[model samples]
Every structure is written in structure tokens, then in C-alpha cells.
Target: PSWPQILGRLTDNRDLARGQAAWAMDQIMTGNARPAQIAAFAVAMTMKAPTADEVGELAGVMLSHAHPLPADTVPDDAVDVVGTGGDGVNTVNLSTMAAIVVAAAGVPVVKHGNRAASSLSGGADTLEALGVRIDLGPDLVARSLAEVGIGFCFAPRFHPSYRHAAAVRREIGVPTVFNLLGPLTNPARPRAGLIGCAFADLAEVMAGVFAARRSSVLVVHGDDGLDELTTTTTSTIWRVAAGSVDKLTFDPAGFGFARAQLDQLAGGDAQANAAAVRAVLGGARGPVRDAVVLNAAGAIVAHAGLSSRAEWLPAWEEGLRRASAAIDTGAAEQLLARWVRFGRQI
Candidate 1:
């Protein structure tokens, strides 16, 4: 389909917008659409307000175009802790830190992420700042996960089809549907995921996407406007599994944490964020450490298939203790070192 036709269909009806948007992405990724054309489509989609199905279709196309890992390496019990960034909070890489802790606690992790898009520092940036290489082939990533229990799939490396759209995405300089697709397109295709969305409404949309995969999922949005599980305010989470989704409110204090201010969680550039990650992993008791343990425990429960808030409590409490020890005893720090050494070879 042509760009004009795609845009016309997108602007005309909500039902047809989903498939049309997928076609538009195909045009952009195949170099059939100009940068300006891609930008126009991006802007048009934003104006129309993409629906859950529309974003899911876009994500499907994006995932189909990515390089996949060998099936043997994609564990059914593995999980990914990531966010659709552009949350504008500028906080430390909470999800990345939590993923490390999750791995240290013996859960497999496939951290799908990228460099800074609309934030001061992103997952790849923070990891790179901490001496881990961000670029790796699918085999190497699988190997890293096997060896260190955690691996980073730098987005572009697995989705080279995105190169044609890269320059335009950078020039347009806004969060497009591509941002929503990243977390959904992990090459490893893990069976569980803890994803954070910048907007609360997107949680339901993303949950719809996760439901179709039948994966154990937790899609969250912080009330204070962070794209992570925060200690400052109540966050909403959509738990999806066995083809059902339940929306629940998350309170840090309910999970044994004091509410914290955004400033206390604010993160700087890559170097500063990396330092903050180390501090949290080294058991520096503060809001940051508490937040990491909270999210890490969430990832653990999500992957472990504990069904509801009631069932989650016992498991979460135990997971939190293990997560805390993983940090306090320097196990997370050691895992980070192993990952860095493995990544350097990639």
C-alpha cells in the first residue's frame, strides 16, 4: 500500500487503522517511504490516537522483521524487564537494575533495550557506561544469558530492518509507535515479561498485546509519571496470564516501602546512572534500592506464574528477601561483572 493510502485509511477509521499502520511501517522499513513521509505518517498516527489493536499490529510487523534467536536458547521461563521509554522522568535505569537483580536471584533474563531516545540515559547507555558492550549478535546474546543469567538485546542489532527508519526517527525526535514495539519484539521471545508503559492507558493496550501471546505479563505505569514501578505514588499494573488480564493498583508501602520523591529517584547522564546502578546493587539503603528490589520481585513473581495480588504477596515477600540479598551480599554486582566480561567479547 502507498503512504497516502495508508494515511487515508488511518485517518478514516479505527478498525482499518491497525493494518494500515502496519503497512506504513513496512513502507518505511523497506525504504519505499521517504523520511518526510514516515514523519507524516508518525504524526498522523499520533493525531489519530492509535488503538490497542493498531499498536499491536505495528508490533507484530516489527517482530516479524527482527532476527530471531535459536529456539533452543529461548527459555519458556525467561523474563524481560523493560519499558517503552520517553517517560520524561530522567530517573535512573530502574528496570535494568531490577533485571540484573532478577538474574542474580536465578531467573533468566532477556533485557530488550536501546540507547537514549527521549531520556537522559537508556538501558543500553547505562549498561555501556558500566563497561558492558551493547551490540551483540543473537547467538552471542543467547550465550551471554546462558553464561551470566542475563543478556542485553540492543534493539537495532536484532532489528536491522529499522535502519531505513533510524535517521527519520532521530530527526522526527518523538516517541512513535516504534517505541511501543521495542519491548514487544524481543528476539528471544521470552514467556514472561514485566513491561512499563509511559502512559497508564497504554498499559491496557500493551496488556492486550501480551494476552495474545499467552505470556505471563505485568504492564505498569507509575502515578507520578514515571515509566516504572515507583515508590513515590501508586502505580497501576495489568497482570495477564492464561488469556485473562486484571488491573490492580500498586502501593509501595503495601509492599513494605516508604513513599519517595521523584528527586530522590532522579538520574543524570550515563555515567551517573551507571554509578547509581552500582550503588543500588551494593546495598546502599535508600529509595533507589527499595525501588529496585520492588521491581525485581515483581519480575520474579510475574515469571514464576503466581496468579493474583493475593498469591503474589507470599511469593513477592520471599522474592524480595532473595532480591535484597542478591544486592546486599554483592551477588548482583558479581553478575553484572560477569555480564560485562561476556559482553566485551561480543
Candidate 2:
């Protein structure tokens, strides 16, 4: 059908069929949809809130369009840890810091992200400020994963097919399905991932998308609306595997992390956040370090393929233990230095 018809379906409070969602996205990504139509689809879709089935259809199209990275380049154990930003909180670069620490714990990490998602510095911004190249060839990323234990895909480079909708997203200037879909569209091809969703409802949608693929991933949202698990409030978590989503809750204090005020984790601009990240890497302890350790342990839990629901907290606390050990041994600093040093050649 046409874009107008699809918009009509969405406006009528009807979710698009699998083919419609896929076709609509193909139109947007391939430059076939007009700017007006693209905006309508994005806005209406956001308002209507597609079911997990529609999301799986849409996400499949998006991921299929990303630039190719060899499957073998991705480690079997690597888990992509990312977040759908829009939390409106200027929090520290927890995901990036978590990636470094998670990698240090011996599971390779594949992260696909961009610059600041709001006023808060994103994974790309802080990594760049830390002197690591934000963009790299697939070969370089592969090398980083294989050697340094962390691989970063700056999203723009790997998803150039998104140009048309990207320009529209920039001009319209609001978070859209593209924002919700970004973390779900990892081009790095990690088998498992930890996805932080800013919107609690969307977390379920994301889980359905991954579960439909029989792809296991952990999707989380805090009670306070922070995308990652929050120390300030209990966070909701969904673990999707083999076509089912098992919902759960996490309390940082229950997991042995002291409940921290969000202010304690506040971060400034890219440069300032990078400085703080360096301190965390150097073993400085506080709410900031605790936050990173908590988030990293989330990734570590994501990295493992658990056998039963009972193993969840055990695996999680084990992840926490590994993160602490990684920090204590200076493994994060050493691994981060090697990756940063490798990037300086560019």
C-alpha cells in the first residue's frame, strides 16, 4: 500500500501488519517516502505505540540496512550494551564506562552509539574525549574486540542508509521510532545485548522484538525513568529468550550497591565526563564508581546465557564480583589504554 494508507492504519489505532511496517521502513530508508510522510509515520507511530509484533517487523528492516560487519569478527560472548536516550538527565557516561569494565571482566563488548543523546555526553562523546577514535573500519573494530576486548561502532558510519530519515529526524527535532530503534539496530551483530529503554512501555516492545527473533537480550528501565537500572529506585527488567519474555525487577541496594542520589552520578560535558571516567578507571570509589560497576555488571549478566530464572541474581552478583575484580586489578585502565593507543594512529 501507500504511505498514506499506512498512516491511516496507525491513526485509526490499528497496528501495521508485518509487511506494512517493513515496507514503511523500507520507504523511509530508501528515500522513497516524502519528508512529510516520513514525519507523519514517525509521529503517529510514536503516538500509537506499535505492538511487539510490529516492532519486530520494523527492527528487522532497520538492522538489515546497516553496513555489513563479518559475523566472525564478533566474539561469541560479546554483548552489545546500549540505551535509548531521552531520559532528560545529565547523567554520567555509565554505558561506555560499563563497556570498558565489562570487557575487562573477560567478555568482549560490542557497542554501537553516537555523540551526546541530550545534554549528557554519549558513549561516542566520552570515548572520543578519552582520546579513542569514535569512527573506525570494521577491521579496526574487529581488532579492538579481538585484542582490546571492546569494539565500538559509531552508528552514523555503520548506518549510512539512514541518511534520508536521519536528516528528517534532525529537522523535525524530536525523538522518534529511530531513537527507540537505534539500540535495537546494532550492526556489530553481537548475539546478546543489554538495552536500556528510556520509556518503560517501550522496554516491553523492545523485548518482544528481540524475543520474536529468538534473540536473547536484557531490556531495562528504572522506576525513576533512567534508561539503565537506577540506584534511586527499583528498575524493571525483561529478559527475552526463545520467543518469551520473563519480566523481573532489580534493586541496587538489594544487589549490594548502595542507593545513590542521582546528583552523585552527575556528569558535565564530554571533556568533563571523560575526566571522571578516567578517575573511575583509576579505582576511585564513590557513587560514580558504584553506578558504573552496577551497569557493567548488568552487561556481564547479559553476556552469560543462563539456564533458569533462579540463576539470574547469582549471575548478576557474579557479574558484580567480576566488575569489582576488573577494577581492582586495573584491567579496565590497561584495556582502555591499549584501545586508546591503537586509535591514536588515525
**Per-model TM against the reference:** 0.93, 0.96
Give the clash count for each candidate.
0, 0
lDDT of 2 by residue, 1-346 (tens): 8977899999998888769989998988888988999899988988898787777766778788888677678866668888987788888888888888998889888898888757568889899999888889788888878877888998888888788887788788787776778888888777777889988767888888878766668898988888887788788999876678999988888877777888887889899999999999999999889988888888888776533453677888798999999999999999899999888764
Off by over 4 Å in 2: 306-310
Backbone-clash count (model 1) = 0
lDDT tens per residue, model 1, 268-343: 9999999999888877898899889989988887886734343767877887888888988889999998888887
**Considering summed lDDT, which 10 consecutive residues are worst modelled in model 2?**
303-312
**Deviation in Å, model 2, residue 299 alpha carbon:** 0.9
Residue pairs with backbone atoms closer than 3 Å in model 1 (clashes): none
Q: Report model 1's TM-score to 2 decimal places.
A: 0.93
The C-alpha lDDT values of all candidates are: 0.83, 0.83
